[PDB]
């Protein structure tokens, strides 16, 4: 039920990551030669360009957007042990740098809007840092708030998008160390209001192979959570709280339709279709059937 098309865009070098905005009208593509671009769209249905600049001293890995109720903020992280914040004055300018790392930075993500304007950043040394902006007037003033150690090399992070009044803020981080020894790879933390700190919640001991990406699912008023893991086989979990908070953990998907290593995972707006891009050059979409069973619903070739 899914078709393909080719978008009319020209790029000089290989692309590394692509992200969208809230409404789905803008775009940002980090490239190989340390250049990022903005791709705006018109009523007719075509993409034009608006900006292009060089940012870091090394390869740029991931870029992401921020909620419109704060501005037109972006975020990028590179191998040069830095992560920068941009804005829009029709020329983007730099407003802050995060130099407090001592090794390559691999991921940067924006916290949900319902808790202010915060930022999460993990390094290869095995540490995550939670930043914040006390005022939404000055984007040059940031403060380090929390510090979490994982004791393992970090590869991916993800926030919990739930915005209920009975769900504490929680984060998840995965590892990719290829050691012969068997150890847990995915960890989950949560923030305790009474003591104001982040504590370990659960460790998915069922996973020992390296993990390359992790993504949560928009809650949309559900009674549990959904998580997806990107490893030698795509896995889908289900974390449900039992009245740190105890959780019940299950498995509902162990697809092997790649014969390779999956590399990226991303959900849609409602939280019912999944996208997986592997090492065979094809993108496959999955979706739950009419009997709460996950069955593949389309193969797309590059």
Partner 1 sequence: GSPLDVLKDERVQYWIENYRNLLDAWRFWHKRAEFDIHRSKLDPSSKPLAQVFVSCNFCGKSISSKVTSCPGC
Partner 2 sequence: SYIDLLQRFRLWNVSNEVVKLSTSRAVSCLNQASTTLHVNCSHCKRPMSSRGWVCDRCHRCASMCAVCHHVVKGLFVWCQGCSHGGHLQHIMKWLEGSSHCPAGCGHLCEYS
For residue 180, is it left (φ>0), alpha (ψ between -120 and 50) or beta? Answer: alpha
Cα 153 to its chain centre, rounded Å, is 17
CA distance 239 to 227: 8
99 binds, options partner 1, partner 2, none, Cβ within 5 to 8 A by partner type: none
Query: First CA to last CA across the chain, in angstroms?
Result: 17
Q: At its nearest, how many Å lie between partner 2 and the CB of residue 117?
A: 11
If residue 188 lies in a helix (H) or strand (E), which one and from where to where?
A: strand 186-192
Q: Min. distance of Cβ 220 from partner 1 in angstroms?
A: 6
Residue 165's binding partner, choosing from partner 1, partner 2, none, with beta-carbon cut-off 5 to 8 A by kind?
A: partner 1
Residue 90, number of CB atoms within 10 A of its CB: 7
The answer to whether 96 and 103 have CB atoms below 8 angstroms apart is no
Minimum distance from CB of 222 to partner 1 (Å)?
10
Q: What angle do CA 214, 295, 228 make, to 5 degrees?
A: 10
Residue 269 touching partner 1 (CB under 8 A): yes
Tell me if 274 sits within 8 A of 265, measured CB to CB: yes
Of residues 70 and 247, the one with the C-beta less far from partner 2? 70
Q: Which stretch binds partner 1 (CB under 8 A): 5-13, 21-29, 102-110, 146-154?
A: 21-29
Could you tell which of partner 2, partner 1, none binds residue 23, using a CB distance below 5 to 8 A set by kind? Answer: partner 1
**In contact, 6 and 289? CB cutoff 8 Å:** no
What distance lies between CA 260 and its chain's CA centroid?
A: 22
User: Which of 68, 298 has the CB closer to partner 2?
Assistant: 68
- Shortest distance (Å) from residue 165 CB to partner 2: 17
The reply on whether position 137 binds partner 2 by CB under 8 A is yes
Select from 20, 22, 224, 263 the one that contacts partner 1 (CB under 8 A): 22
Work out which of 221, 291, 301, 302 binds partner 1, going by CB under 8 A.
221
Say whether residue 23 binds partner 1 (CB under 8 A): yes
Q: How far apart are CA 302 and CA 293, in angstroms?
A: 27
Least distance (Å) from partner 2 to the CB of residue 136? 6
Residues numbered 155 to 214 that lie near partner 1 (CB under 8 A) are 164-166
């Amino acid at each position: 039920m899914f078709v393909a098309r080719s978008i009319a865009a020209d790029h000089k070098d290989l692309i590394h990551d692509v992200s969208f905005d809230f409404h789905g009208r803008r775009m940002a593509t980090c490239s190989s030669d340390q250049s990022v671009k903005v791709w705006d769209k018109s009523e007719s249905g075509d993409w034009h360009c608006t900006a292009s600049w060089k940012t870091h001293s090394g390869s740029v890995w991931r870029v992401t957007w921020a909620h419109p109720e704060f501005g037109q903020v972006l975020a990028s992280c590179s191998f040069d042990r830095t992560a920068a914040v941009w804005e829009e004055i029709s020329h983007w300018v730099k407003r802050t740098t995060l130099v407090d790392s001592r090794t390559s930075v691999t991921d940067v993500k924006f916290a949900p809007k319902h808790m202010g304007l915060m930022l999460a950043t993990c390094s290869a040394d095995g540490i995550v840092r939670i930043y914040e902006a006390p005022d939404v007037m000055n984007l040059s003033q940031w403060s380090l708030q929390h510090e979490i150690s994982c004791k393992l090399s970090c590869s991916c992070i993800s926030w919990n998008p739930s915005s209920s009044r009975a769900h504490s803020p929680m984060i998840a981080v995965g590892s990719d160390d290829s050691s012969p020894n068997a150890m847990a790879k995915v960890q989950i933390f949560e923030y305790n209001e009474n003591t104001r700190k982040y504590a370990k919640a659960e460790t998915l001991m069922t996973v020992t192979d390296p993990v390359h990406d992790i993504a949560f699912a928009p809650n949309l008023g559900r009674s549990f959570h959904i998580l997806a893991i990107a490893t030698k086989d795509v896995r889908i979990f289900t974390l449900k709280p039992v009245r740190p908070t105890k959780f019940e953990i299950h498995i509902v998907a162990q697809f092997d339709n790649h014969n390779s290593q999956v590399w990226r995972v991303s959900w849609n707006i409602t939280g019912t279709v999944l996208a997986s891009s592997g090492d065979d050059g094809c993108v496959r979409l999955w979706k739950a059937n009419y009997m709460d069973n996950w069955k593949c619903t389309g193969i797309l070739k590059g």
